[PDB]
Amino acid sequence: TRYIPDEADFLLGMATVNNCVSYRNPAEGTWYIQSLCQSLRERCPRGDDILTILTEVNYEVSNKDDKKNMGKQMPQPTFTLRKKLVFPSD
Amino acid sequence: TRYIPDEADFLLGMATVNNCVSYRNPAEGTWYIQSLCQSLRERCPRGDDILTILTEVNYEVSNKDDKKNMGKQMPQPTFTLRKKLVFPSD
Amino acid sequence: DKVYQMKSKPRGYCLIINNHNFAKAREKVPKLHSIRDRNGTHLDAGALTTTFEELHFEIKPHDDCTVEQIYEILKIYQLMDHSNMDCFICCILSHGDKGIIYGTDGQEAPIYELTSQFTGLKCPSLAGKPKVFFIQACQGDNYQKGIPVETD
Amino acid sequence: DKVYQMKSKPRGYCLIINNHNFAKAREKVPKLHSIRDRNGTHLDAGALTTTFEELHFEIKPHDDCTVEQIYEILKIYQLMDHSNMDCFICCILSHGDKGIIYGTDGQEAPIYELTSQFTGLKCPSLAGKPKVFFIQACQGDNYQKGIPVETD
Numbered sequence: 412t413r414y415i416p417d418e419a420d421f422l423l424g425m426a427t428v429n430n431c432v433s434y435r436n437p438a439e440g441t442w443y444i445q446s447l448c449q450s451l452r453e454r455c456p457r458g459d460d461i462l463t464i465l466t467e468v469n470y471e472v473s474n475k476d477d478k479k480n481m482g483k484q485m486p487q488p489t490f491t492l493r494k495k496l497v498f499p500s501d
Numbered sequence: 502t503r504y505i506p507d508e509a510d511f512l513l514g515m516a517t518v519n520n521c522v523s524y525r526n527p528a529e530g531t532w533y534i535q536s537l538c539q540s541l542r543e544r545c546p547r548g549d550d551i552l553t554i555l556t557e558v559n560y561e562v563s564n565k566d567d568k569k570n571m572g573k574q575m576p577q578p579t580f581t582l583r584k585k586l587v588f589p590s591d
Numbered sequence: 592d593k594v595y596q597m598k599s600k601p602r603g604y605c606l607i608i609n610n611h612n613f614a615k616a617r618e619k620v621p622k623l624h625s626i627r628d629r630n631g632t633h634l635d636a637g638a639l640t641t642t643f644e645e646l647h648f649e650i651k652p653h654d655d656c657t658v659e660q661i662y663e664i665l666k667i668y669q670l671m672d673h674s675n676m677d678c679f680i681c682c683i684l685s686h687g688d689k690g691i692i693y694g695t696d697g698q699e700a701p702i703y704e705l706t707s708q709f710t711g712l713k714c715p716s717l718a719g720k721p722k723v724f725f726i727q728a729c730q731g732d733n734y735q736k737g738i739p740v741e742t743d
Numbered sequence: 744d745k746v747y748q749m750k751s752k753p754r755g756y757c758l759i760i761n762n763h764n765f766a767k768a769r770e771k772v773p774k775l776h777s778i779r780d781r782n783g784t785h786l787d788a789g790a791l792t793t794t795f796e797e798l799h800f801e802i803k804p805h806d807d808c809t810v811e812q813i814y815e816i817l818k819i820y821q822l823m824d825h826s827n828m829d830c831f832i833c834c835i836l837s838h839g840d841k842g843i844i845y846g847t848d849g850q851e852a853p854i855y856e857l858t859s860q861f862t863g864l865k866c867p868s869l870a871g872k873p874k875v876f877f878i879q880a881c882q883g884d885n886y887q888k889g890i891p892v893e894t895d
């Protein structure tokens with residue numbers, strides 16, 4: 412039989428890079444999760460893979476700002492995926 | 502003007518997940534770098550993006566083994582890229 | 592291009608750990624005396640539920656978990672038979688700091704201690720299958736600075 | 744789908760830090776008494792050179808760097824004008840351990856201390872542009888175990 416690494420086939424979607432804050436709008440939800448869900452719902456029906464979708468999440472969350480602290484948020488995926496990951500809607 | 506995060510637009514290609522070894526064949530080069538270069542040379546001319554290429558590297562290196570220690574190697578990209586990254590050959 | 596098989600119905604379990612009430616942390620952990628309740632987190636839980644049900648996952652919500660409770664929940668899913676599933680998703684909504692998430696009790700769970708419960712050896716029925724973790728938490732107390740760029 | 748601009752000729756600099764000789768580490772750092780010379784690493788340096796020259800990058804090789812020398816090299820590129828470049832690549836070939844790479848002298852350089860020299864604030868002429876780091880090193884002394892799967 413074939414063997415692959417013990418830690419293969421993981422995708423870790425972090426709301427933020429290390430050392431930094433992520434944001435929650437109490438009236439809407441978090442920048443990261445709300446962006447993630449919007450991108451999944453729009454792009455999964457089109458057959459887009461999860462890394463493409465998470466790149467869009469990076470783009471969208473990068474354009475948001477905290478005007479009180481002049482803050483930004485940078486999400487950050489990490490992966491040991493060995494194949495394309497798609498979530499078909501059908 | 503528009504603002505994006507300080508740490509945006511990074512791609513970190515790690516030869517291995519944390520806590521673990523990566524391999525160097527003294528007569529060929531490292532599993533990771535040799536696989537990376539092969540995939541770049543084959544796929545960049547086709548217009549494939551770097552996350553697709555690095556997924557292939559994950560796949561290829563995952564099939565290699567160290568028959569002395571029964572060891573594997575799992576590479577691991579991490580990114581704050583906000584757009585698709587392609588290296589056109591032309 | 593190789594693509595993970597994603598045809599099973601349901602696709603797999605989608606766990607949601609949704610931490611709102613941090614009263615225990617405020618009372619128990621000196622440095623978390625002013626850690627806040629995560630008002631509005633249910634909107635994320637709902638969005639994730641809607642989204643992943645649409646994508647054919649079986650949603651398993653858990654509200655207001657201590658670290659011990661989180662580990663218990665993951666152990667249950669680690670020992671479960673995923674043989675008829677093509678994927679596993681775990682969503683964590685909580686406070687956090689560098690490399691960790693907080694239980695409602697203010698105890699720390701290293702992110703690696705959560706994900707590593709589903710390695711091939713520890714959950715063989717997920718061997719070769721995608722395991723996806725979404726972590727909504729701070730990873731420190733620094734406000735990421737902005738940089739000016741040209742508009743797309 | 745948005746794509747990073749990648750049209751400049753050259754595309755950018757591709758730094759290669761190629762560490763082979765660890766004599767200094769063996770003599771200076773007690774715990775690295777038996778750290779080995781990285782025989783064959785030049786084959787990686789060459790492969791990276793061939794590959795990225797083909798892709799229109801200007802290759803900047805540096806062999807056998809201590810930690811201080813690595814930081815000096817990165818500082819040079821941090822202060823350089825990348826305004827006419829579309830990308831920056833840095834390749835590190837060395838020994839390492841959890842979260843770090845070793846200089847030839849056996850000193851430790853945290854990977855974040857290398858990458859964070861090229862943030863938007865520290866290198867504004869790379870603001871909005873891809874910064875790519877390839878790190879070939881161990882990240883610990885554990886042999887990753889294998890798991891059996893069905894053949895594709």
Ligand SMILES: *CC(=O)[C@H](CC(=O)O)NC(=O)[C@@H]1C=C(CC2CCCCC2)Cn2c(=O)n(CCNC(=O)c3ccc4[nH]cnc4c3)c(=O)n21
Binds near residue numbers: 433727729
């Ligand atoms: C730090 C964390 O782990 C949580 C993660 C979470 O709840 O999802 N992040 C916050 O709570 C976030 C961070 C801070 C910074 C503090 C720095 C010192 C140490 C404690 C954290 C502050 N905090 C906070 O008070 N809120 C809740 C209120 N949010 C808003 O008013 C708001 C946010 C975003 C937004 N977009 C549009 N309108 C709004 C309003 C936070 O989410 N944070």
Ligand SMILES: *CC(=O)[C@H](CC(=O)O)NC(=O)[C@@H]1C=C(CC2CCCCC2)Cn2c(=O)n(CCNC(=O)c3ccc4[nH]cnc4c3)c(=O)n21
Binds near residue numbers: 526781837879881
């Ligand atoms: C640990 C590191 O940082 C380096 C990274 C590098 O040189 O790219 N990795 C090694 O040196 C790698 C790891 C070990 C494990 C040891 C565990 C205890 C602490 C020290 C490290 C052993 N080591 C080693 O001796 N070699 C060189 C010889 N390689 C081969 O014989 C070989 C490897 C792969 C292969 N494929 C096909 N044929 C071969 C032959 C290593 O690369 N490692």
